[PDB]
């Protein structure tokens, strides 16, 4: 025998690769152009996200309806978390790396008409640097975000979901023991990481509020949304605004 491999290696394998925004820095940085570009970018990342989720250990066994529900509830969280990861790995969290050809500095944050939201997402990137987050921890946390919110009345296969989520939590516990050592700095790190996952709920709440607004006012604001997002948001918005969503917390729940 040798080691007892975890899905971690598998997760690293299915990890989607960078997608370009197709942005041209020479044209005007209007809010219309920036947000429309960002929404089209999201559409492309989303295809990768679904492809990624489809082969996830455990998640792949959930019924189609629960997989769709989970993805529609967590897409913003996944997108934002991945943004902070890229910002961390590519710029040491000095900028918001939406894509290799679309990196936001303070100036673009103001022109996007999303300044405060960009700051919130940036703060997560800052945490990644303060903790020197590892790719291993990151991939498991991504899965945990996918499993971070369910319907108020639970899923179709709730019990199976709870077992899968528990396993991924234990998995994170395994990883948090790796990177460091010194029992102390593992008990502590696991706490900080799960506390960070919880903070994603508040951030996503603000992100979604702005998202639903621009979606509703899409025509008057001239903010385009790709078919991929139109479908997801059209389904997600009604549920979220009616209080059907139930965020799962690790702490202060």
């Amino acid at each position: 025998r040798a080691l007892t491999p975890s899905p971690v290696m598998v997760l690293e394998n299915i990890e989607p690769e960078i997608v370009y925004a197709g942005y041209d820095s020479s044209k005007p940085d209007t809010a219309e152009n920036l947000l429309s570009t960002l929404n089209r970018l999201a559409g492309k990342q989303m295809i990768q996200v679904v492809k990624w989720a489809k082969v996830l250990p455990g998640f792949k066994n959930l019924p189609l309806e629960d997989q769709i529900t989970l993805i529609q509830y967590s897409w913003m969280s996944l997108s934002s978390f991945a943004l902070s990861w890229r910002s961390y790995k590519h710029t040491n969290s000095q900028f918001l790396y939406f894509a290799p050809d679309l990196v936001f500095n303070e100036e673009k944050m103001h022109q996007s008409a999303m300044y405060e939201l960009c700051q919130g997402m940036h703060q997560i990137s800052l945490q990644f640097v303060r903790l020197q987050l590892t790719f291993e921890e990151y991939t498991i946390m991504k899965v945990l975000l996918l499993l971070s919110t369910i319907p108020k009345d639970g899923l179709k296969s709730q019990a199976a979901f709870e077992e899968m989520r528990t396993n991924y939590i234990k998995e994170l516990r395994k990883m948090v023991t790796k990177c460091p050592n010194n029992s102390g700095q593992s008990w502590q790190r696991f706490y900080q990481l799960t506390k960070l996952l919880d903070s994603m709920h508040d951030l996503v709440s603000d992100l979604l509020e702005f998202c639903f607004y621009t979606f509703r006012e899409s025509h008057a604001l001239k903010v385009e949304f790709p078919a991929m997002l139109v479908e997801i948001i059209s389904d997600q918005l009604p549920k979220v605004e009616s209080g059907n969503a139930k965020p799962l917390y690790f702490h202060r729940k």
Partner: peptide, 12 residues
Amino acid sequence: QQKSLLQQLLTE
């Protein structure tokens, strides 16, 4: 149902 990008991608 018919179509739905999410459904397609998950069963492609």
